[PDB]
Design a protein around this ligand. Structure first.
Ligand SMILES: [Cl-]
Lengths: 45, 16, 45, 45, 16, 16
């Protein structure tokens, strides 16, 4: 019964790693948008 | 927005 | 004792699903901002 | 054996809290970019 | 984009 | 930024 608990756990850990990788991708794209807004504002001013 | 009306050219994006 | 382990687990799974749904919302908004920056840059150039 | 299960669980919960805090930071920055695009578009129009 | 060509000045950022 | 100074009109947002 608990053996199943270990597998569901390896599963939760796997989904957690996928979430962390997705968050890392989001942060990189968000940083590009921050840079892009900075460039456009400098052009406008 | 922009850091509670801080001005400062955008305040570096509200400090990032 | 382990029965509790199954419930805390259903709980972790529930929070994981909420995190995945929030990430999906964030990605959709981030895509709108990417599109918006693209439109403003095209106007400026 | 299951005692270990409780610790790995406290660990998963800890990583979940870190993920939720990171998501909260991302949402705040994403909101700043949405506001910034809004200001630049108003200037351009 | 922008809310399936909705126009509307951007539609408030595609409704946020 | 913008893809290590790649230019290219923005490089499609640093390739998205
Ligand atoms: Cl998680």
């Amino acid at each position: 019964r608990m053996k199943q608990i270990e597998d569901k756990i390896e599963e939760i850990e796997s989904k957690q790693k996928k979430i962390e990788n997705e968050i890392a991708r989001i942060k990189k794209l968000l940083q590009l948008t921050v840079w892009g807004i900075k460039q456009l504002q400098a052009r406008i001013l | 927005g922009x850091x509670x009306x801080x001005x400062x050219x955008x305040x570096x994006x509200x400090x990032x």
